[PDB]
Amino acid sequence: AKDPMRVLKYAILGLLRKGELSGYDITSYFKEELGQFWSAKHSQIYPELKKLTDEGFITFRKKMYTLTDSGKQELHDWLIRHQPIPETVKDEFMLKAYFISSLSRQEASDLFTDQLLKRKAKLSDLQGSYEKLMASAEPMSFSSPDFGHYLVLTKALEREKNYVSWLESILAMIDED
Amino acid sequence: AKDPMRVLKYAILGLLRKGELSGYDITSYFKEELGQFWSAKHSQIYPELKKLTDEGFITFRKKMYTLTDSGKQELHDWLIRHQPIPETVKDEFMLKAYFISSLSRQEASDLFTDQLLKRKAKLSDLQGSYEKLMASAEPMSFSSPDFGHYLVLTKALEREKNYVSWLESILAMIDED
Numbered sequence: 054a055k056d057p058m059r060v061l062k063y064a065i066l067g068l069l070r071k072g073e074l075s076g077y078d079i080t081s082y083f084k085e086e087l088g089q090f091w092s093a094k095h096s097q098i099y100p101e102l103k104k105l106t107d108e109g110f111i112t113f114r115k116k117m118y119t120l121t122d123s124g125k126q127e128l129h130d131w132l133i134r135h136q137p138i139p140e141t142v143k144d145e146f147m148l149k150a151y152f153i154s155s156l157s158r159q160e161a162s163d164l165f166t167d168q169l170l171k172r173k174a175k176l177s178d179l180q181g182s183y184e185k186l187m188a189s190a191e192p193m194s195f196s197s198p199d200f201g202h203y204l205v206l207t208k209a210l211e212r213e214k215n216y217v218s219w220l221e222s223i224l225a226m227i228d229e230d
Numbered sequence: 231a232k233d234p235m236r237v238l239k240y241a242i243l244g245l246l247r248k249g250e251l252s253g254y255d256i257t258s259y260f261k262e263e264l265g266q267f268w269s270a271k272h273s274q275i276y277p278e279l280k281k282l283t284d285e286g287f288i289t290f291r292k293k294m295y296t297l298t299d300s301g302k303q304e305l306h307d308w309l310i311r312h313q314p315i316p317e318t319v320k321d322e323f324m325l326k327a328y329f330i331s332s333l334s335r336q337e338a339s340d341l342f343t344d345q346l347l348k349r350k351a352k353l354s355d356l357q358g359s360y361e362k363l364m365a366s367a368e369p370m371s372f373s374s375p376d377f378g379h380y381l382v383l384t385k386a387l388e389r390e391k392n393y394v395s396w397l398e399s400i401l402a403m404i405d406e407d
Protein backbone atom coordinates (compact mmCIF):
# COMPACT_ATOMS: atom_id res chain seq x y z
CA ALA A 54 0.00 0.00 0.00
CA LYS A 55 1.03 3.57 -0.79
CA ASP A 56 0.89 6.39 1.74
CA PRO A 57 -2.41 8.34 1.58
CA MET A 58 -0.64 11.66 2.43
CA ARG A 59 0.90 11.55 -1.07
CA VAL A 60 -2.33 13.28 -2.28
CA LEU A 61 -0.79 16.49 -0.91
CA LYS A 62 2.37 16.24 -3.03
CA TYR A 63 1.52 18.55 -5.92
CA ALA A 64 -0.44 20.89 -3.72
CA ILE A 65 2.73 21.46 -1.69
CA LEU A 66 5.09 21.70 -4.72
CA GLY A 67 2.70 24.09 -6.43
CA LEU A 68 2.39 26.34 -3.36
CA LEU A 69 6.18 26.82 -3.50
CA ARG A 70 6.25 27.64 -7.26
CA LYS A 71 6.54 31.43 -6.76
CA GLY A 72 9.22 31.28 -4.07
CA GLU A 73 9.95 30.43 -0.46
CA LEU A 74 7.26 29.81 2.18
CA SER A 75 7.38 28.90 5.87
CA GLY A 76 5.56 25.80 7.17
CA TYR A 77 3.08 28.19 8.82
CA ASP A 78 2.48 29.86 5.41
CA ILE A 79 1.90 26.43 3.78
CA THR A 80 -0.40 25.30 6.60
CA SER A 81 -2.26 28.63 6.31
CA TYR A 82 -2.91 28.07 2.58
CA PHE A 83 -4.49 24.68 3.38
CA LYS A 84 -6.84 26.43 5.82
CA GLU A 85 -7.78 29.10 3.16
CA GLU A 86 -8.90 28.44 -0.40
CA LEU A 87 -6.86 25.37 -1.05
CA GLY A 88 -8.69 23.51 1.73
CA GLN A 89 -12.01 24.21 0.01
CA PHE A 90 -11.15 22.15 -3.11
CA TRP A 91 -8.05 20.17 -2.07
CA SER A 92 -8.60 19.41 1.61
CA ALA A 93 -5.74 18.20 3.77
CA LYS A 94 -5.92 16.19 6.91
CA HIS A 95 -3.84 18.74 8.73
CA SER A 96 -1.75 15.97 10.45
CA GLN A 97 -0.47 14.97 6.98
CA ILE A 98 0.99 18.33 5.86
CA TYR A 99 4.30 18.38 7.79
CA PRO A 100 4.97 14.71 7.18
CA GLU A 101 4.49 15.13 3.45
CA LEU A 102 6.70 18.24 3.47
CA LYS A 103 9.40 16.14 5.12
CA LYS A 104 9.02 13.39 2.51
CA LEU A 105 9.33 15.82 -0.39
CA THR A 106 12.43 17.37 1.24
CA ASP A 107 13.98 14.00 1.74
CA GLU A 108 13.18 13.15 -1.93
CA GLY A 109 15.12 16.23 -3.03
CA PHE A 110 12.08 18.12 -4.45
CA ILE A 111 12.15 20.78 -1.71
CA THR A 112 14.92 22.25 0.40
CA PHE A 113 14.74 24.30 3.59
CA ARG A 114 16.84 26.88 5.35
CA LYS A 115 11.71 29.36 11.21
CA LYS A 116 12.25 26.73 8.48
CA MET A 117 11.71 28.30 5.06
CA TYR A 118 11.06 25.95 2.18
CA THR A 119 11.76 26.29 -1.55
CA LEU A 120 11.58 24.15 -4.69
CA THR A 121 14.79 22.56 -5.97
CA ASP A 122 15.39 22.22 -9.70
CA SER A 123 14.18 18.61 -9.29
CA GLY A 124 11.00 19.81 -7.61
CA LYS A 125 10.30 22.37 -10.35
CA GLN A 126 10.70 19.59 -12.94
CA GLU A 127 8.42 17.23 -10.92
CA LEU A 128 5.73 19.96 -10.83
CA HIS A 129 6.15 20.77 -14.48
CA ASP A 130 5.94 17.15 -15.65
CA TRP A 131 2.68 16.71 -13.65
CA LEU A 132 1.18 19.96 -14.99
CA ILE A 133 1.71 18.95 -18.59
CA ARG A 134 0.83 15.24 -18.21
CA HIS A 135 -2.47 14.30 -19.94
CA GLN A 136 -4.62 11.87 -17.94
CA PRO A 137 -7.99 10.31 -18.77
CA ILE A 138 -10.83 12.03 -16.96
CA PRO A 139 -11.50 10.20 -13.76
CA GLU A 140 -14.50 8.14 -12.73
CA THR A 141 -17.48 10.10 -11.53
CA VAL A 142 -17.35 11.09 -7.91
CA LYS A 143 -20.08 9.43 -5.80
CA ASP A 144 -22.79 11.99 -4.94
CA GLU A 145 -25.05 10.41 -2.31
CA PHE A 146 -27.85 12.81 -3.12
CA MET A 147 -27.80 11.59 -6.72
CA LEU A 148 -28.12 7.96 -5.57
CA LYS A 149 -31.25 9.02 -3.66
CA ALA A 150 -32.50 10.73 -6.82
CA TYR A 151 -31.96 7.45 -8.74
CA PHE A 152 -34.33 5.75 -6.27
CA ILE A 153 -36.88 8.55 -6.22
CA SER A 154 -39.66 6.04 -7.06
CA SER A 155 -39.62 5.11 -3.33
CA LEU A 156 -40.79 8.64 -2.43
CA SER A 157 -44.15 10.32 -2.75
CA ARG A 158 -44.43 13.57 -4.75
CA GLN A 159 -44.35 15.55 -1.51
CA GLU A 160 -41.41 13.59 -0.09
CA ALA A 161 -39.51 14.10 -3.37
CA SER A 162 -40.29 17.81 -3.31
CA ASP A 163 -39.06 18.01 0.30
CA LEU A 164 -35.82 16.11 -0.50
CA PHE A 165 -35.01 18.29 -3.50
CA THR A 166 -36.03 21.55 -1.70
CA ASP A 167 -33.65 20.72 1.18
CA GLN A 168 -30.84 20.15 -1.31
CA LEU A 169 -31.63 23.37 -3.23
CA LEU A 170 -31.55 25.53 -0.11
CA LYS A 171 -28.21 24.07 0.94
CA ARG A 172 -26.69 24.49 -2.53
CA LYS A 173 -27.93 28.12 -2.73
CA ALA A 174 -26.26 28.83 0.61
CA LYS A 175 -22.99 27.25 -0.61
CA LEU A 176 -23.26 29.32 -3.76
CA SER A 177 -23.68 32.46 -1.60
CA ASP A 178 -20.51 31.62 0.28
CA LEU A 179 -18.58 31.09 -2.98
CA GLN A 180 -19.88 34.37 -4.33
CA GLY A 181 -18.49 36.03 -1.12
CA SER A 182 -15.09 34.48 -1.77
CA TYR A 183 -15.30 35.61 -5.41
CA GLU A 184 -16.05 39.20 -4.44
CA LYS A 185 -13.09 39.15 -2.01
CA LEU A 186 -10.80 37.93 -4.75
CA MET A 187 -12.08 40.49 -7.18
CA ALA A 188 -11.64 43.36 -4.73
CA SER A 189 -7.99 43.49 -5.97
CA ALA A 190 -6.95 46.57 -8.01
CA GLU A 191 -5.37 44.81 -10.97
CA PRO A 192 -7.93 43.66 -13.58
CA MET A 193 -8.30 39.87 -14.11
CA SER A 194 -6.56 38.23 -17.04
CA PHE A 195 -4.28 35.35 -17.89
CA SER A 196 -1.22 37.39 -16.76
CA SER A 197 -2.71 38.23 -13.35
CA PRO A 198 -0.89 36.61 -10.41
CA ASP A 199 -4.36 35.69 -9.16
CA PHE A 200 -5.47 33.88 -12.33
CA GLY A 201 -5.14 30.42 -10.80
CA HIS A 202 -7.26 31.38 -7.78
CA TYR A 203 -9.82 32.86 -10.24
CA LEU A 204 -9.92 29.59 -12.14
CA VAL A 205 -10.71 27.43 -9.08
CA LEU A 206 -13.28 29.92 -7.80
CA THR A 207 -15.11 30.45 -11.10
CA LYS A 208 -15.13 26.71 -11.60
CA ALA A 209 -16.79 26.25 -8.18
CA LEU A 210 -19.30 29.06 -8.79
CA GLU A 211 -20.31 27.58 -12.17
CA ARG A 212 -20.52 24.09 -10.71
CA GLU A 213 -22.83 25.12 -7.89
CA LYS A 214 -24.95 27.49 -10.07
CA ASN A 215 -25.48 24.58 -12.45
CA TYR A 216 -26.45 22.26 -9.59
CA VAL A 217 -28.92 24.85 -8.36
CA SER A 218 -30.43 25.30 -11.82
CA TRP A 219 -30.79 21.56 -12.25
CA LEU A 220 -32.49 21.21 -8.87
CA GLU A 221 -34.87 24.05 -9.79
CA SER A 222 -35.70 22.24 -13.08
CA ILE A 223 -36.47 19.03 -11.22
CA LEU A 224 -38.60 20.74 -8.57
CA ALA A 225 -40.61 22.23 -11.44
CA MET A 226 -41.12 18.69 -12.82
CA ILE A 227 -42.13 17.39 -9.38
CA ASP A 228 -44.56 20.40 -9.31
CA GLU A 229 -45.90 19.92 -12.82
CA ASP A 230 -48.93 21.99 -13.81
CA ALA B 231 -12.13 0.49 10.80
CA LYS B 232 -15.41 0.00 8.93
CA ASP B 233 -15.74 -2.18 5.84
CA PRO B 234 -15.31 -0.19 2.59
CA MET B 235 -17.90 -2.37 0.76
CA ARG B 236 -20.59 -0.69 2.90
CA VAL B 237 -20.64 2.08 0.22
CA LEU B 238 -22.76 -0.33 -1.85
CA LYS B 239 -25.46 -0.72 0.83
CA TYR B 240 -28.09 1.74 -0.40
CA ALA B 241 -27.32 1.04 -4.02
CA ILE B 242 -28.26 -2.60 -3.40
CA LEU B 243 -31.34 -1.84 -1.24
CA GLY B 244 -32.54 0.69 -3.78
CA LEU B 245 -32.11 -1.72 -6.72
CA LEU B 246 -34.53 -4.10 -4.94
CA ARG B 247 -37.16 -1.39 -4.23
CA LYS B 248 -39.47 -2.41 -7.11
CA GLY B 249 -39.31 -6.16 -6.44
CA GLU B 250 -37.16 -9.25 -6.63
CA LEU B 251 -33.87 -9.46 -8.56
CA SER B 252 -31.31 -12.22 -9.07
CA GLY B 253 -27.64 -11.67 -8.17
CA TYR B 254 -26.94 -11.63 -11.92
CA ASP B 255 -29.57 -8.86 -12.35
CA ILE B 256 -27.96 -6.84 -9.51
CA THR B 257 -24.45 -7.36 -10.89
CA SER B 258 -25.75 -6.36 -14.34
CA TYR B 259 -27.11 -3.05 -13.00
CA PHE B 260 -23.65 -2.23 -11.58
CA LYS B 261 -22.17 -2.79 -15.05
CA GLU B 262 -24.84 -0.50 -16.68
CA GLU B 263 -25.79 3.00 -15.58
CA LEU B 264 -25.28 2.57 -11.89
CA GLY B 265 -21.57 1.86 -12.45
CA GLN B 266 -21.20 5.19 -14.22
CA PHE B 267 -22.07 7.27 -11.12
CA TRP B 268 -21.88 4.74 -8.25
CA SER B 269 -19.07 2.39 -9.25
CA ALA B 270 -18.63 -0.93 -7.49
CA LYS B 271 -15.51 -2.95 -7.14
CA HIS B 272 -17.24 -5.97 -8.55
CA SER B 273 -15.64 -8.28 -5.88
CA GLN B 274 -17.60 -6.34 -3.22
CA ILE B 275 -21.14 -6.84 -4.58
CA TYR B 276 -21.88 -10.43 -3.45
CA PRO B 277 -20.23 -9.94 -0.09
CA GLU B 278 -22.30 -6.86 0.61
CA LEU B 279 -25.45 -8.66 -0.53
CA LYS B 280 -24.64 -11.38 1.99
CA LYS B 281 -24.12 -8.83 4.76
CA LEU B 282 -27.45 -7.12 4.09
CA THR B 283 -29.20 -10.53 4.06
CA ASP B 284 -27.59 -11.49 7.31
CA GLU B 285 -28.65 -8.08 8.77
CA GLY B 286 -32.27 -8.87 7.88
CA PHE B 287 -32.63 -6.09 5.26
CA ILE B 288 -32.85 -8.53 2.34
CA THR B 289 -34.11 -12.08 2.03
CA PHE B 290 -33.56 -14.64 -0.73
CA ARG B 291 -35.35 -17.64 -2.12
CA LYS B 292 -30.96 -19.10 -8.86
CA LYS B 293 -31.08 -17.06 -5.62
CA MET B 294 -33.69 -14.31 -5.94
CA TYR B 295 -33.43 -11.41 -3.53
CA THR B 296 -36.08 -9.07 -2.11
CA LEU B 297 -36.35 -6.32 0.49
CA THR B 298 -37.76 -7.20 3.91
CA ASP B 299 -39.93 -4.72 5.78
CA SER B 300 -36.75 -3.81 7.71
CA GLY B 301 -34.89 -3.19 4.46
CA LYS B 302 -37.67 -0.98 3.08
CA GLN B 303 -37.53 1.06 6.29
CA GLU B 304 -33.69 1.28 6.13
CA LEU B 305 -33.95 2.59 2.54
CA HIS B 306 -36.71 5.00 3.42
CA ASP B 307 -34.93 6.47 6.44
CA TRP B 308 -31.80 7.08 4.29
CA LEU B 309 -33.82 8.66 1.45
CA ILE B 310 -35.45 11.18 3.75
CA ARG B 311 -32.39 11.91 5.95
CA HIS B 312 -31.00 15.45 5.43
CA GLN B 313 -27.19 15.61 5.39
CA PRO B 314 -24.85 18.58 5.01
CA ILE B 315 -23.43 18.81 1.50
CA PRO B 316 -20.13 17.04 1.42
CA GLU B 317 -16.64 18.43 0.97
CA THR B 318 -15.64 19.18 -2.57
CA VAL B 319 -14.34 16.23 -4.50
CA LYS B 320 -10.66 16.58 -5.48
CA ASP B 321 -10.37 17.35 -9.21
CA GLU B 322 -6.70 16.99 -10.17
CA PHE B 323 -7.19 19.10 -13.25
CA MET B 324 -8.43 21.95 -11.07
CA LEU B 325 -5.30 21.73 -8.88
CA LYS B 326 -3.25 22.15 -12.09
CA ALA B 327 -5.42 25.14 -12.98
CA TYR B 328 -4.68 26.65 -9.54
CA PHE B 329 -0.95 26.50 -10.41
CA ILE B 330 -1.36 27.75 -13.96
CA SER B 331 1.27 30.47 -13.30
CA SER B 332 3.90 27.73 -13.86
CA LEU B 333 2.77 27.37 -17.49
CA SER B 334 3.31 29.55 -20.51
CA ARG B 335 0.28 30.85 -22.45
CA GLN B 336 0.75 28.10 -25.02
CA GLU B 337 1.23 25.38 -22.39
CA ALA B 338 -1.93 26.59 -20.61
CA SER B 339 -3.85 26.59 -23.87
CA ASP B 340 -2.64 23.04 -24.58
CA LEU B 341 -3.60 21.81 -21.07
CA PHE B 342 -7.09 23.30 -21.25
CA THR B 343 -7.62 22.18 -24.90
CA ASP B 344 -6.78 18.58 -23.95
CA GLN B 345 -9.29 18.74 -21.11
CA LEU B 346 -11.99 20.31 -23.33
CA LEU B 347 -11.68 17.62 -26.00
CA LYS B 348 -11.95 14.87 -23.40
CA ARG B 349 -14.96 16.48 -21.69
CA LYS B 350 -16.72 16.97 -25.06
CA ALA B 351 -16.22 13.29 -25.82
CA LYS B 352 -17.63 12.31 -22.39
CA LEU B 353 -20.55 14.63 -23.04
CA SER B 354 -21.14 12.87 -26.38
CA ASP B 355 -21.25 9.52 -24.64
CA LEU B 356 -23.75 10.83 -22.05
CA GLN B 357 -25.90 12.28 -24.80
CA GLY B 358 -25.93 8.75 -26.39
CA SER B 359 -27.11 7.26 -23.11
CA TYR B 360 -29.74 10.02 -22.83
CA GLU B 361 -31.09 9.31 -26.30
CA LYS B 362 -31.29 5.59 -25.46
CA LEU B 363 -33.25 6.36 -22.33
CA MET B 364 -35.55 8.71 -24.15
CA ALA B 365 -36.27 6.21 -26.92
CA SER B 366 -38.99 4.80 -24.57
CA ALA B 367 -42.64 5.30 -25.64
CA GLU B 368 -44.00 6.76 -22.41
CA PRO B 369 -43.34 10.51 -22.06
CA MET B 370 -41.02 11.62 -19.20
CA SER B 371 -42.51 12.93 -15.99
CA PHE B 372 -42.35 12.47 -12.25
CA SER B 373 -44.67 9.41 -12.50
CA SER B 374 -42.52 7.67 -15.13
CA PRO B 375 -40.83 4.47 -13.90
CA ASP B 376 -37.71 5.85 -15.55
CA PHE B 377 -37.71 9.19 -13.71
CA GLY B 378 -34.82 8.24 -11.42
CA HIS B 379 -32.64 7.20 -14.36
CA TYR B 380 -33.58 10.51 -16.06
CA LEU B 381 -32.48 12.42 -12.98
CA VAL B 382 -28.99 10.87 -12.82
CA LEU B 383 -28.50 11.23 -16.58
CA THR B 384 -29.69 14.85 -16.86
CA LYS B 385 -27.56 15.70 -13.85
CA ALA B 386 -24.49 14.22 -15.61
CA LEU B 387 -25.28 15.94 -18.92
CA GLU B 388 -25.67 19.33 -17.19
CA ARG B 389 -22.51 18.78 -15.16
CA GLU B 390 -20.38 18.00 -18.19
CA LYS B 391 -21.97 20.72 -20.41
CA ASN B 392 -21.14 23.22 -17.68
CA TYR B 393 -17.56 21.95 -17.43
CA VAL B 394 -17.21 22.29 -21.19
CA SER B 395 -18.61 25.82 -21.18
CA TRP B 396 -16.26 26.84 -18.39
CA LEU B 397 -13.26 25.40 -20.23
CA GLU B 398 -14.32 27.28 -23.38
CA SER B 399 -14.54 30.52 -21.34
CA ILE B 400 -11.05 30.00 -19.96
CA LEU B 401 -9.54 29.14 -23.35
CA ALA B 402 -11.00 32.42 -24.61
CA MET B 403 -9.23 34.23 -21.73
CA ILE B 404 -5.96 32.42 -22.48
CA ASP B 405 -6.55 33.56 -26.14
CA GLU B 406 -7.47 37.13 -25.31
CA ASP B 407 -7.72 39.57 -28.22
Ligand SMILES: O=C(O)/C=C/c1ccc(O)cc1
Nearest residue numbers: 086089090182205206209318
Ligand atom coordinates in the same frame (compact mmCIF):
# COMPACT_ATOMS: atom_id res chain seq x y z
O1 LIG C 1 -14.45 23.95 -5.16
C1 LIG C 1 -14.96 24.46 -4.10
O2 LIG C 1 -15.91 23.95 -3.50
C2 LIG C 1 -14.47 25.72 -3.58
C3 LIG C 1 -13.45 26.37 -4.09
C4 LIG C 1 -12.98 27.67 -3.58
C5 LIG C 1 -11.94 28.23 -4.27
C6 LIG C 1 -11.43 29.47 -3.93
C7 LIG C 1 -12.00 30.18 -2.85
O3 LIG C 1 -11.46 31.38 -2.53
C8 LIG C 1 -13.04 29.60 -2.14
C9 LIG C 1 -13.57 28.37 -2.51
Ligand SMILES: O=C(O)/C=C/c1ccc(O)cc1
Nearest residue numbers: 141263266267359382383386
Ligand atom coordinates in the same frame (compact mmCIF):
# COMPACT_ATOMS: atom_id res chain seq x y z
O1 LIG D 1 -22.60 10.71 -13.60
C1 LIG D 1 -22.06 10.17 -14.64
O2 LIG D 1 -20.89 10.39 -14.98
C2 LIG D 1 -22.84 9.31 -15.50
C3 LIG D 1 -24.09 8.97 -15.25
C4 LIG D 1 -24.88 8.12 -16.15
C5 LIG D 1 -26.18 7.90 -15.77
C6 LIG D 1 -27.05 7.17 -16.54
C7 LIG D 1 -26.61 6.63 -17.77
O3 LIG D 1 -27.49 5.90 -18.49
C8 LIG D 1 -25.29 6.83 -18.15
C9 LIG D 1 -24.42 7.59 -17.38
